[PDB]
Amino acid sequence: QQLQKEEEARKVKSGIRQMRLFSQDECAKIEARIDEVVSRAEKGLYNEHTVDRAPLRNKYFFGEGYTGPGQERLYPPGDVDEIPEWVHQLVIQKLVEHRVIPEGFVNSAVINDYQPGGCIVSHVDPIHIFERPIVSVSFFSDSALCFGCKFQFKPIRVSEPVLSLPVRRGSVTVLSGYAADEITHCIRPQDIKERRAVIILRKTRLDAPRL
Ligand SMILES: O=C(O)CNC(=O)C(=O)O
Numbered sequence: 357q358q359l360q361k362e363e364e365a366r367k368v369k370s371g372i373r374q375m376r377l378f379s380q381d382e383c384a385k386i387e388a389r390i391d392e393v394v395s396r397a398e399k400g401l402y403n404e405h406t407v408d409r410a411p412l413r414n415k416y417f418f419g420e421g422y423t424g425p426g427q428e429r430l431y432p433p434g435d436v437d438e439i440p441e442w443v444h445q446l447v448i449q450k451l452v453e454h455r456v457i458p459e460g461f462v463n464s465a466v467i468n469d470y471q472p473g474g475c476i477v478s479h480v481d482p483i484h485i486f487e488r489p490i491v492s493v494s495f496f497s498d499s500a501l502c503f504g505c506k507f508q509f510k511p512i513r514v515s516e517p518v519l520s521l522p523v524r525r526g527s528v529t530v531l532s533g534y535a536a537d538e539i540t541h542c543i544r545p546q547d548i549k550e551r552r553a554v555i556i557l558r559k560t561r562l563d564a565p566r567l
């Protein structure tokens with residue numbers, strides 16, 4: 357049981373790469389742009405499916421977005437707004453330059469914006485929708501990304517995740533293999549003490565089922 361948790365954590369770690377790529381100034385500039393997105397959404401300037409509002413977490417879908425169990429679908433072409441130029445210029449370019457992902461890979465950029473006490477429940481990034489690797493960049497504050505999220509449903513039987521990964525402002529997280537496909541991830545509400553935002557950069561699959 358203890359050996360099993362250590363083996364799983366080793367497997368999770370084999371599919372995680374992390375690096376501090378964005379300076380405090382670079383973060384400040386990107387954070388200003390994220391604020392612009394929030395403002396534009398509030399002004400009703402985005403397409404219908406670009407904005408997903410939920411109690412303590414908003415999602416903003418660019419390039420491609422998605423919606424019983426395990427049957428998410430891509431919205432028809434042109435339903436979501438295009439990836440903003442600043443995302444290419446300030447975020448994707450930096451990633452390509454540092455050999456994190458190849459040029460042309462990213463066709464989907466999602467911004468998650470969290471209130472204090474916000475969270476995201478146990479999930480796997482839909483395997484029928486997105487290629488791997490999955491890249492994420494964190495912005496306003498530091499937090500943690502948990503892996504193996506049974507604890508969110510069975511706190512008596514299991515109190516802790518398999519692994520908790522610190523995700524600092526300006527850090528890039530790359531998920532692949534076991535970490536992206538074989539285990540769930542989540543964020544605990546106690547780990548978001550102040551506003552936090554994340555830009556998730558992915559490539560959708562050719563055969564991603566569409567509406
Ligand atoms: O906010 C984060 O760091 C993680 N968010 C997600 O896992 C997601 O939107 O798929």
Ligand SMILES: [Mn+2]
Pocket residue numbers: 479480481541
């Ligand atoms: Mn996810």
